[PDB]
């Protein structure tokens, strides 16, 4: 709407919910949406783990840079940026560096294991990050290395 104000709209992502006036249970309406969501998350993560991401090849003058999410140039016209923002954009394009570390998967019931992970930055909304966190939690709930399983 103005110079430094950027607004993200809440577009509908998951459709669910059955309305029955005879029973007035909000808890029942939430369960119907949640159950449909649980099946969709389970379908996406079945027999699959998230390993593939877009990137920029590590050249001689730069490190690994992520290009995941909305292209930065789409924003040029979607936000109608002035020259200051357009100048700023290449700076924030180069700060999107992929991080590497180790994490712990599983819980007290399934078990505990350490694996190698990556943290790839991307451009998007905040609900996107919540959904991705849920998907990662669903996919890695039962992960075991060959050493641990053999032992």
């Amino acid at each position: 709407p103005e110079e430094n104000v950027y607004i993200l709209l809440p577009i509908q992502a998951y459709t669910g919910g059955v309305i029955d006036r005879r029973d007035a249970s909000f808890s029942n309406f939430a369960y119907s949406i949640a159950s449909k969501l649980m099946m969709e998350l389970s379908a996406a993560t079945h027999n699959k783990i998230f390993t593939d991401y877009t990137r920029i090849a590590a050249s001689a003058l730069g490190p690994e840079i992520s290009t995941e999410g909305m292209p930065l140039f789409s924003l040029i016209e979607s936000l109608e940026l002035t020259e200051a923002e357009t100048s700023r954009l290449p700076v924030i394009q180069d700060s999107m560096v992929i991080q590497k570390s180790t994490a712990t998967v599983g819980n007290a019931q399934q078990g505990i294991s350490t694996i190698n992970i990556k943290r790839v930055p991307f451009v998007g909304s905040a609900f996107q990050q919540v959904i991705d966190q849920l998907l990662w939690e669903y996919s890695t709930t039962s992960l075991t290395t060959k050493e641990q399983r053999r032992q």
Binding site: N4, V5, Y6, I7, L8, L9, P10, I49, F50, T51, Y53, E68, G69, M70, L75, E85, R88, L89, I92, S95, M96, K100, A103, I115, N116, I117, K118, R119, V120, P121, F122, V123, G124, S125, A126, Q128, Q129, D132, Q133, W136, T145, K146, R149, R150
Partner: protein, 46 residues
Amino acid sequence: YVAVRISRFQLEVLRDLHDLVRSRTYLDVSKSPLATTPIRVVEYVR
């Protein structure tokens, strides 16, 4: 004549371009690869 209106609209105001950047989590297949074959267990009786 009568108007049907809502309350409590939720929207996100970012105030900066660097706030559009978030993070995900991936698997590092370079050092934690995916197994292609289950371990084969051969058992005998005692």
